[PDB]
Amino acid sequence: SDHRELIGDYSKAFLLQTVDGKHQDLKYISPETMVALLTGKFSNIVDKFVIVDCRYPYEYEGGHIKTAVNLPLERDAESFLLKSPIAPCSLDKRVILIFHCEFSSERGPRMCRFIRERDRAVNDYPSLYYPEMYILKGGYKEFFPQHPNFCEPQDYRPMNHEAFKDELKTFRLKTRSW
Ligand SMILES: [Cl-]
């Protein structure tokens, strides 16, 4: 039994415990749950889980969660996740996606909604390639101070970092829209 609704293709319940977050309709997990996945607490059930860090490349380069992939542009995310979907090695097992940015307030959530839109578009309702997707509450900023040893390099570079103003500006000119 679970007290929540089913995952996106209505096949089963969400596996992870969720916390309250700004977007009322999205599912958020805490840093602690992120570490349970990374330490293999759900290995019997989760075949693969992809951590999508939606921050700009310099932020990611200054310190990210181990194994995370950096996909800041919608275009990169669609190509990496939807061109050749990442599927479980066993039907019994699940694939899960986790998105986050610096605070998981804007960037993260947006990329998450965008991937579900495209996943809906290319499938017959209600099947999905990624029916179960969460947001890391607090983003890298809250994660780093708590589990520094799960990040590489062991540092944090804010988007607003004074020495990367130029980098910030250059990168935004690469987005599909402002
Ligand atoms: Cl973009």
Name the residue with tokens 């209600």.
126
CA distance 39 to 126: 32
For the CA atoms of 157, 160, 165, 168, the dihedral, rounded to the nearest 10 degrees, stands at 80
Query: What are the Cα distances from residue 14, in Å, to 9, 107, 143?
Result: 11, 23, 22
Return all residues near 163 (Cβ < 8 A) that are at least 6 apart.
Answer: none
How many A from CA of 114 to the centre of ligand 1? Answer: 10
Query: What are the Cα distances from residue 84, in Å, to 12, 65, 119, 148?
Result: 23, 24, 12, 32
Annotation marks residue 151 as catalytic: no
- Resolution of the model in angstroms: 2.0
b or e along 75-101 (b: 16 or more beta carbons within 10 Å of the residue's beta carbon)?
eebbeebbeeeeeeeeeeebbbbbbbb
Experiment type: X-ray
Active-site pick, 54, 89, 101, 112: 101
How many A from CA of 177 to the centre of ligand 1? Answer: 7
Read off the CATH number of the domain in which 165 is found. Answer: 3.40.250.10
How many A from CA of 111 to the centre of ligand 1? Answer: 9
Contact 140, 156 (CB under 8 A): yes
Return all residues near 136 (Cβ < 8 A) that are at least 6 apart.
Answer: 28, 29, 31, 34, 51, 98, 99, 100, 104, 108, 143
What is the separation, in whole angstroms, between the first and last Cα of the chain? 43
Tokens of residue 33, six digits: 């749950």
Name the residue with tokens 């479980």.
88
Contact 14, 4 (CB under 8 A): yes
Helices (H), the chain: 31-38, 57-61, 74-77, 107-121, 139-146, 165-172
How many A from CA of 73 to the centre of ligand 1? Answer: 4
Return all residues near 89 (Cβ < 8 A) that are at least 6 apart.
Answer: 47, 48
Number of domains in the chain: 1
Tokens of residue 164, six digits: 């990367």
Among candidate residues 162, 156, 152, the one with its CA nearest the CA of residue 140? 156
CA distance 37 to 20: 19
Return all residues near 144 (Cβ < 8 A) that are at least 6 apart.
Answer: 63, 151, 156
Structural domain including 52 reads 1-178
**Interior angle at CA 154, CA 150 and CA 155, nearest 5:** 125
- 19: β partners: 28
b or e along 37-69 (b: 16 or more beta carbons within 10 Å of the residue's beta carbon)?
beeeebeeebbebbbbbbbbebbbebbbbeebe
